[PDB]
Amino acid sequence: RFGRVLDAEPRLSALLSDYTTPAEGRVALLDKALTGRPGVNQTAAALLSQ
Amino acid sequence: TAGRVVRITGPVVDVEFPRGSVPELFNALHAEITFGALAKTLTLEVAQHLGDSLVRCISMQPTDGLVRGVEVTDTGASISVPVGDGVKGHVFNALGDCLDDPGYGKDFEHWSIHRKPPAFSDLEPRTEMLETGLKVVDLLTPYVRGGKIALFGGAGVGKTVLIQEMINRIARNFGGTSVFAGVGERTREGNDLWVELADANVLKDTALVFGQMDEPPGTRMRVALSALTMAEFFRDEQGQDVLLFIDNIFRFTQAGSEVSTLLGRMPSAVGYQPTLADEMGELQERITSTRGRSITSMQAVYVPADDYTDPAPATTFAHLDATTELSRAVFSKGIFPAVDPLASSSTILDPAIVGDEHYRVAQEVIRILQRYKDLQDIIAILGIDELSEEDKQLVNRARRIERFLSQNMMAAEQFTGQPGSTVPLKETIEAFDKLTKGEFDHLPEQAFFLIGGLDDLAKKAESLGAKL
Amino acid sequence: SAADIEGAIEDYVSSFEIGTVIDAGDGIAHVEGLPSV
Ligand SMILES: Nc1ncnc2c1ncn2[C@@H]1O[C@H](COP(=O)(O)OP(=O)(O)O)[C@@H](O)[C@H]1O
Ligand SMILES: [Mg+2]
């Protein structure tokens, strides 16, 4: 589901994909925007953040 | 959904689009240059898909002042130009914008400049002489109505003077529509042609599409397509005879080769793009008459460095019905039009079409001129006295013939200060039949220089002290 | 949600010119930076 939604919104995926920006900011972005949700498996969240 | 500029290198721009929004090939994209001095809207034609959602485009306007990352909008369609009777009497650029009346024609029907050529089943060979009044053209390079005519030659041999002469002789009384495509030529010549057409009252019936040699390569690539689209509309929709004048078609190929290496293509022989023949073939095959629908097209073809073996003119040769080949050597002799009678050709110069007498006289003229060409070196080294009697007689005849193929053209009055002349085809045939028989050997060869028919010949001979 | 992601990226951008010669020679230089040039 995360892959599908990320494909749907290429803007956010491209923003995350920019490795130039420090990865801490992008992983925090993912945590607060997408990975941080009620119905999100913690293991899947950790895997995606990594 | 909009793209952004990634790389800018001269006329070639790389644009990155979001996945699934990549424009189709040849689509028109729009970008903004906001720098005040050069502020404008760039039109970019998608040339290649580079993968990863990048497209390589050719700019139609200079890219100076363009910035990386600026928004790029996709029009969803190719470059399109106005079509209809309204375009007659007006001057446009490759993008369809009216130059004499900016904003004019925006509400007309618009046609994409990219089009497939007519189906092979719709093609019918054309065999019908188009008399011009020029002795050399009518005798040795008879033009075909509804066929394809080319004027080959190097720089400054009389291609444009001859194009203007043919405009005067053909379009002045044409019952249909005329389209003039100025492909990568001098702007001064374009202004002169515009003024001349307005004065002659031929402009009302003519649509002018100009892309000058100062335009970037993309404009010179696409201006011919724009003018050809107007002509195609007139052929297929209005159902009327069309005159298509192109000057200079070589500029299309040259502009194509200017961006070939910037587009990533390995160069071919003589520096041309690998796709020279294919692009030329598409464009030329669009310039044709179909069954019942006439396009008499006349193209000026520039021969780089006078080298007729150059791949561009050599590839162009296969697309023509009649070819008047202008020679620098003939030019430097003062013979005008500087036609090389031994190198020009016409597909209808055969007994079946032009008739037994015309064909016979033409063949005799060509044989005499070929023999004279063979004897030139001997005359230069060993002198004319060492030739056989028949060879001396033939040399005199050939010199008179080459002078008589010269003619005072109307379009040349600005240069010679002498009014032009028009010679009926029958008079031309009779005069050259008399020449090849030696009926004018007693006249000084100077009497045959830059005149019209046999009446002008008699007058000039009287002026020089001779009489026929 | 499909909307809070918007506010997220905008807040990111809000919370998120001099070039530099990277190489030179023979009258040619290459400059990194200057995204607006
Ligand atoms: N019929 C002619 N009589 C006298 N001079 C001519 C004639 N045709 C061409 N010229 C001279 O040669 C020049 C080149 O002609 P033009 O056709 O403009 O160049 P190009 O052949 O490169 O198109 C003219 O500007 C003119 O001075
Ligand atoms: Mg010219």
PDB file of N, CA and C in Angstrom, chain B residues 106-154:
ATOM      1  N   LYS B 106      -5.284  34.278 -35.680  1.00  0.00           N
ATOM      2  CA  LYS B 106      -5.320  33.461 -34.471  1.00  0.00           C
ATOM      3  C   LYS B 106      -6.602  32.650 -34.383  1.00  0.00           C
ATOM      4  N   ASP B 107      -7.682  33.139 -34.985  1.00  0.00           N
ATOM      5  CA  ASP B 107      -8.971  32.464 -34.944  1.00  0.00           C
ATOM      6  C   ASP B 107      -9.198  31.534 -36.129  1.00  0.00           C
ATOM      7  N   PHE B 108      -8.248  31.442 -37.055  1.00  0.00           N
ATOM      8  CA  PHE B 108      -8.396  30.550 -38.193  1.00  0.00           C
ATOM      9  C   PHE B 108      -8.289  29.095 -37.744  1.00  0.00           C
ATOM     10  N   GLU B 109      -8.680  28.194 -38.639  1.00  0.00           N
ATOM     11  CA  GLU B 109      -8.392  26.785 -38.434  1.00  0.00           C
ATOM     12  C   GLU B 109      -6.884  26.568 -38.464  1.00  0.00           C
ATOM     13  N   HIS B 110      -6.390  25.756 -37.537  1.00  0.00           N
ATOM     14  CA  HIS B 110      -4.966  25.490 -37.404  1.00  0.00           C
ATOM     15  C   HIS B 110      -4.684  24.038 -37.754  1.00  0.00           C
ATOM     16  N   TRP B 111      -3.630  23.819 -38.530  1.00  0.00           N
ATOM     17  CA  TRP B 111      -3.196  22.490 -38.929  1.00  0.00           C
ATOM     18  C   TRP B 111      -1.808  22.224 -38.374  1.00  0.00           C
ATOM     19  N   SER B 112      -1.599  21.008 -37.879  1.00  0.00           N
ATOM     20  CA  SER B 112      -0.273  20.608 -37.435  1.00  0.00           C
ATOM     21  C   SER B 112       0.691  20.602 -38.613  1.00  0.00           C
ATOM     22  N   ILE B 113       1.923  21.050 -38.368  1.00  0.00           N
ATOM     23  CA  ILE B 113       2.911  21.103 -39.442  1.00  0.00           C
ATOM     24  C   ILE B 113       3.529  19.750 -39.739  1.00  0.00           C
ATOM     25  N   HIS B 114       3.236  18.733 -38.937  1.00  0.00           N
ATOM     26  CA  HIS B 114       3.744  17.387 -39.156  1.00  0.00           C
ATOM     27  C   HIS B 114       2.628  16.544 -39.756  1.00  0.00           C
ATOM     28  N   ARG B 115       2.902  15.941 -40.906  1.00  0.00           N
ATOM     29  CA  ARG B 115       1.877  15.266 -41.679  1.00  0.00           C
ATOM     30  C   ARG B 115       2.518  14.141 -42.472  1.00  0.00           C
ATOM     31  N   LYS B 116       1.768  13.071 -42.660  1.00  0.00           N
ATOM     32  CA  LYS B 116       2.238  12.014 -43.532  1.00  0.00           C
ATOM     33  C   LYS B 116       2.063  12.429 -44.992  1.00  0.00           C
ATOM     34  N   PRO B 117       2.928  11.960 -45.882  1.00  0.00           N
ATOM     35  CA  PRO B 117       2.771  12.283 -47.298  1.00  0.00           C
ATOM     36  C   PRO B 117       1.593  11.538 -47.895  1.00  0.00           C
ATOM     37  N   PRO B 118       1.173  11.901 -49.104  1.00  0.00           N
ATOM     38  CA  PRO B 118       0.035  11.213 -49.719  1.00  0.00           C
ATOM     39  C   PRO B 118       0.319   9.733 -49.918  1.00  0.00           C
ATOM     40  N   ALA B 119      -0.743   8.937 -49.862  1.00  0.00           N
ATOM     41  CA  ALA B 119      -0.613   7.508 -50.098  1.00  0.00           C
ATOM     42  C   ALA B 119      -0.131   7.252 -51.521  1.00  0.00           C
ATOM     43  N   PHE B 120       0.647   6.181 -51.685  1.00  0.00           N
ATOM     44  CA  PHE B 120       1.226   5.893 -52.992  1.00  0.00           C
ATOM     45  C   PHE B 120       0.155   5.709 -54.057  1.00  0.00           C
ATOM     46  N   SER B 121      -0.999   5.156 -53.687  1.00  0.00           N
ATOM     47  CA  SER B 121      -2.057   4.922 -54.661  1.00  0.00           C
ATOM     48  C   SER B 121      -2.650   6.216 -55.199  1.00  0.00           C
ATOM     49  N   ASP B 122      -2.424   7.340 -54.526  1.00  0.00           N
ATOM     50  CA  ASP B 122      -2.969   8.624 -54.945  1.00  0.00           C
ATOM     51  C   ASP B 122      -2.019   9.413 -55.833  1.00  0.00           C
ATOM     52  N   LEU B 123      -0.862   8.859 -56.175  1.00  0.00           N
ATOM     53  CA  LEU B 123       0.153   9.564 -56.942  1.00  0.00           C
ATOM     54  C   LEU B 123       0.014   9.232 -58.420  1.00  0.00           C
ATOM     55  N   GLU B 124       0.033  10.266 -59.257  1.00  0.00           N
ATOM     56  CA  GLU B 124      -0.062  10.113 -60.704  1.00  0.00           C
ATOM     57  C   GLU B 124       1.084  10.898 -61.326  1.00  0.00           C
ATOM     58  N   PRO B 125       1.925  10.285 -62.158  1.00  0.00           N
ATOM     59  CA  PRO B 125       3.013  11.050 -62.777  1.00  0.00           C
ATOM     60  C   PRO B 125       2.477  12.195 -63.623  1.00  0.00           C
ATOM     61  N   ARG B 126       3.177  13.323 -63.569  1.00  0.00           N
ATOM     62  CA  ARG B 126       2.794  14.528 -64.291  1.00  0.00           C
ATOM     63  C   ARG B 126       3.704  14.709 -65.495  1.00  0.00           C
ATOM     64  N   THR B 127       3.103  14.870 -66.672  1.00  0.00           N
ATOM     65  CA  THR B 127       3.854  15.081 -67.913  1.00  0.00           C
ATOM     66  C   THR B 127       3.118  16.148 -68.719  1.00  0.00           C
ATOM     67  N   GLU B 128       3.438  17.408 -68.449  1.00  0.00           N
ATOM     68  CA  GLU B 128       2.815  18.525 -69.153  1.00  0.00           C
ATOM     69  C   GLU B 128       3.735  19.724 -69.022  1.00  0.00           C
ATOM     70  N   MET B 129       4.196  20.248 -70.150  1.00  0.00           N
ATOM     71  CA  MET B 129       5.173  21.325 -70.122  1.00  0.00           C
ATOM     72  C   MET B 129       4.574  22.586 -69.515  1.00  0.00           C
ATOM     73  N   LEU B 130       5.393  23.302 -68.755  1.00  0.00           N
ATOM     74  CA  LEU B 130       5.039  24.593 -68.175  1.00  0.00           C
ATOM     75  C   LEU B 130       5.953  25.627 -68.828  1.00  0.00           C
ATOM     76  N   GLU B 131       5.466  26.241 -69.901  1.00  0.00           N
ATOM     77  CA  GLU B 131       6.280  27.183 -70.656  1.00  0.00           C
ATOM     78  C   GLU B 131       6.579  28.417 -69.816  1.00  0.00           C
ATOM     79  N   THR B 132       7.846  28.829 -69.805  1.00  0.00           N
ATOM     80  CA  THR B 132       8.287  29.976 -69.023  1.00  0.00           C
ATOM     81  C   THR B 132       8.647  31.188 -69.862  1.00  0.00           C
ATOM     82  N   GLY B 133       9.093  30.993 -71.098  1.00  0.00           N
ATOM     83  CA  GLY B 133       9.613  32.073 -71.903  1.00  0.00           C
ATOM     84  C   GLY B 133      11.114  32.231 -71.848  1.00  0.00           C
ATOM     85  N   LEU B 134      11.801  31.455 -71.014  1.00  0.00           N
ATOM     86  CA  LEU B 134      13.254  31.442 -70.978  1.00  0.00           C
ATOM     87  C   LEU B 134      13.769  30.412 -71.972  1.00  0.00           C
ATOM     88  N   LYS B 135      14.622  30.853 -72.896  1.00  0.00           N
ATOM     89  CA  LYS B 135      15.059  29.974 -73.974  1.00  0.00           C
ATOM     90  C   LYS B 135      15.693  28.703 -73.425  1.00  0.00           C
ATOM     91  N   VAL B 136      16.660  28.848 -72.519  1.00  0.00           N
ATOM     92  CA  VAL B 136      17.396  27.685 -72.033  1.00  0.00           C
ATOM     93  C   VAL B 136      16.471  26.747 -71.271  1.00  0.00           C
ATOM     94  N   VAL B 137      15.625  27.297 -70.401  1.00  0.00           N
ATOM     95  CA  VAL B 137      14.744  26.454 -69.599  1.00  0.00           C
ATOM     96  C   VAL B 137      13.765  25.712 -70.495  1.00  0.00           C
ATOM     97  N   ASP B 138      13.162  26.419 -71.448  1.00  0.00           N
ATOM     98  CA  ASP B 138      12.155  25.793 -72.293  1.00  0.00           C
ATOM     99  C   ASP B 138      12.770  24.787 -73.253  1.00  0.00           C
ATOM    100  N   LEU B 139      14.024  24.990 -73.651  1.00  0.00           N
ATOM    101  CA  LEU B 139      14.635  24.099 -74.629  1.00  0.00           C
ATOM    102  C   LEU B 139      15.233  22.864 -73.969  1.00  0.00           C
ATOM    103  N   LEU B 140      15.991  23.048 -72.887  1.00  0.00           N
ATOM    104  CA  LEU B 140      16.803  21.977 -72.330  1.00  0.00           C
ATOM    105  C   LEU B 140      16.352  21.495 -70.960  1.00  0.00           C
ATOM    106  N   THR B 141      15.532  22.263 -70.248  1.00  0.00           N
ATOM    107  CA  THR B 141      15.046  21.871 -68.924  1.00  0.00           C
ATOM    108  C   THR B 141      13.560  22.189 -68.823  1.00  0.00           C
ATOM    109  N   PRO B 142      12.756  21.698 -69.764  1.00  0.00           N
ATOM    110  CA  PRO B 142      11.330  22.045 -69.756  1.00  0.00           C
ATOM    111  C   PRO B 142      10.698  21.730 -68.409  1.00  0.00           C
ATOM    112  N   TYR B 143       9.960  22.697 -67.878  1.00  0.00           N
ATOM    113  CA  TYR B 143       9.344  22.561 -66.570  1.00  0.00           C
ATOM    114  C   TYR B 143       7.991  21.878 -66.694  1.00  0.00           C
ATOM    115  N   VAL B 144       7.615  21.162 -65.641  1.00  0.00           N
ATOM    116  CA  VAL B 144       6.418  20.335 -65.624  1.00  0.00           C
ATOM    117  C   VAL B 144       5.374  21.013 -64.752  1.00  0.00           C
ATOM    118  N   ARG B 145       4.183  21.218 -65.306  1.00  0.00           N
ATOM    119  CA  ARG B 145       3.079  21.733 -64.511  1.00  0.00           C
ATOM    120  C   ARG B 145       2.608  20.660 -63.541  1.00  0.00           C
ATOM    121  N   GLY B 146       2.498  21.022 -62.268  1.00  0.00           N
ATOM    122  CA  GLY B 146       2.183  20.061 -61.240  1.00  0.00           C
ATOM    123  C   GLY B 146       3.342  19.185 -60.830  1.00  0.00           C
ATOM    124  N   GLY B 147       4.518  19.375 -61.427  1.00  0.00           N
ATOM    125  CA  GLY B 147       5.699  18.623 -61.075  1.00  0.00           C
ATOM    126  C   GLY B 147       6.604  19.395 -60.135  1.00  0.00           C
ATOM    127  N   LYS B 148       7.769  18.812 -59.881  1.00  0.00           N
ATOM    128  CA  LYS B 148       8.744  19.365 -58.953  1.00  0.00           C
ATOM    129  C   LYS B 148       9.934  19.895 -59.739  1.00  0.00           C
ATOM    130  N   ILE B 149      10.212  21.184 -59.575  1.00  0.00           N
ATOM    131  CA  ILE B 149      11.294  21.870 -60.264  1.00  0.00           C
ATOM    132  C   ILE B 149      12.287  22.349 -59.220  1.00  0.00           C
ATOM    133  N   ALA B 150      13.572  22.174 -59.503  1.00  0.00           N
ATOM    134  CA  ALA B 150      14.622  22.645 -58.618  1.00  0.00           C
ATOM    135  C   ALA B 150      15.595  23.518 -59.385  1.00  0.00           C
ATOM    136  N   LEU B 151      16.144  24.501 -58.684  1.00  0.00           N
ATOM    137  CA  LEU B 151      17.225  25.342 -59.187  1.00  0.00           C
ATOM    138  C   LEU B 151      18.437  25.070 -58.308  1.00  0.00           C
ATOM    139  N   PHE B 152      19.360  24.264 -58.809  1.00  0.00           N
ATOM    140  CA  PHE B 152      20.586  23.963 -58.093  1.00  0.00           C
ATOM    141  C   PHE B 152      21.642  25.013 -58.408  1.00  0.00           C
ATOM    142  N   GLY B 153      22.597  25.146 -57.506  1.00  0.00           N
ATOM    143  CA  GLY B 153      23.719  26.029 -57.735  1.00  0.00           C
ATOM    144  C   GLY B 153      24.386  26.418 -56.443  1.00  0.00           C
ATOM    145  N   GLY B 154      25.636  26.850 -56.567  1.00  0.00           N
ATOM    146  CA  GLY B 154      26.374  27.358 -55.436  1.00  0.00           C
ATOM    147  C   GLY B 154      25.959  28.768 -55.081  1.00  0.00           C
TER     148      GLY B 154
END
